[PDB]
Design a protein around this ligand. Sequence first.
Ligand SMILES: CCc1ccc2c(CCNC(C)=O)c([C@@H](C3=C(O)[C@@H](c4ccccc4)CC3=O)c3ccccc3)[nH]c2c1
Ligand SMILES: [Zn+2]
Length: 226
Amino acid sequence: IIGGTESKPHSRPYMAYLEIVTSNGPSKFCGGFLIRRNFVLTAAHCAGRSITVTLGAHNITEEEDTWQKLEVIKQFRHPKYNTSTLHHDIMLLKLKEKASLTLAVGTLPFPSQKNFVPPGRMCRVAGWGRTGVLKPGSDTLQEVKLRLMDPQACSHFRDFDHNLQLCVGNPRKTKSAFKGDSGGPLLCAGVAQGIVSYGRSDAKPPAVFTRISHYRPWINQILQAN
Ligand SMILES: CCc1ccc2c(CCNC(C)=O)c([C@@H](C3=C(O)[C@@H](c4ccccc4)CC3=O)c3ccccc3)[nH]c2c1
Ligand SMILES: [Zn+2]
């Protein structure tokens, strides 16, 4: 998160810190959010050979009693996820066991309504990702308020699609998500409407987020069958 503030510790109890393991390189990092006691929603590009989930964290360098380190049994990447266009950047992680409910750890279930969110309003995003283009990931959970932009603002992303994705962040403001934040939620009036996906390498807003409303049928399908 670039240009944000430190979250009040444990104020977003659904937030998940993801360590992504692969065979031929060191750990990489994403965000996610707990939508059921044994399911975390995140981005498909965060898939790996294996993934570890930490719930209940604020400062990720200091072990505390709120931490729950949880094993992932299976990854459900969207079947149409495309590494060229980056369409359908969404994935569900099934946890080996159900998380414990505490003050610091709880679910963020979707409401029944699944209306299409138009441009104009302000939303908030949180994560442990880089605090600048040339800076390291944050030790503490950070968050920032970003504006939903008209789709033409994201035209320069040639594979952007208004029906599939949200266009997020006023170009005139030095505020954004960045690397390490992918997979985290964008909340609009307390409701998750987007998932952090991708933007420019230089972090100039706006950036591209998965539009959750479009994927509600797929999400429901996976949850009901698993
Ligand atoms: C919205 C905020 C924002 C803005 C810009 C980016 C970019 C930079 C995108 N640069 C391009 C596409 O030119 C990225 C890319 C990136 C990660 O997510 C990190 C990563 C962690 C775990 C597994 C794999 C990778 C390491 C990395 O390089 C990335 C890679 C693969 C597909 C999509 C995104 N994420 C972003 C998020
Ligand atoms: Zn604490």
